[model samples]
Target: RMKQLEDKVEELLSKAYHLENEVARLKKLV
Candidate 1:
């Protein structure tokens, strides 16, 4: 059903968002 894929996409998006923020934070340290 659409429910499972929807949740998976949401999770993937948040994970990518988190990674992006982490990278930005690290960039500030350099």
Candidate 2:
């Protein structure tokens, strides 16, 4: 089963998602 790899991908996407939100927020504050 590839469930283990799926979890790893999810974690990476979640991290990237937050980073995207953080950058967007800063741009709005400008």
Candidate 3:
């Protein structure tokens, strides 16, 4: 159970990292 939770957290972090980059890009465009 602990391992699954760790994996889920890592996945969320990875997605957040990508989302942050996209947001930065959009900000520059606007």
Candidate 4:
């Protein structure tokens, strides 16, 4: 159970990181 929770948190971290990069790219376009 702990391992699963750790993995889930890592997944969310990656998702947020990707979103941050995409937002930065979009801002450059504007």
| Candidate with best TM-score | 3
Per-model C-alpha lDDT, please? 0.99, 0.96, 1.00, 0.99
Q: How much lDDT does candidate 3 score?
A: 1.00
Judge candidate 1 at residue 1 and give its lDDT.
86
For model 1, residues 4-29, the per-residue Cα lDDT tens digits are 99999999999999999999999999
Question: Over the stretch 4-26, how does candidate 3's per-residue lDDT look in tens digits?
Answer: 99999999999999999999999
Off by more than 4 A, model 3: none
* lDDT score for residue 19 of model 1: 100
TM-score of each: 0.79, 0.65, 0.90, 0.81
lDDT of 4 by residue, 1-30 (tens): 999999999999999999999999999999
Predictions: Cα RMSD each: 0.8, 1.6, 0.4, 0.7
- What stretches of model 4 exceed 4 Å from their correct place? none
Q: Which parts of model 2 have CA positions greater than 4 angstroms off?
A: none
Query: How far off is residue 11 in model 3, in Å?
Result: 0.3
lDDT of 1 at 10: 100
Give the per-residue lDDT digits (tens) of candidate 2, residues 1-30.
599999999999999999999999999999
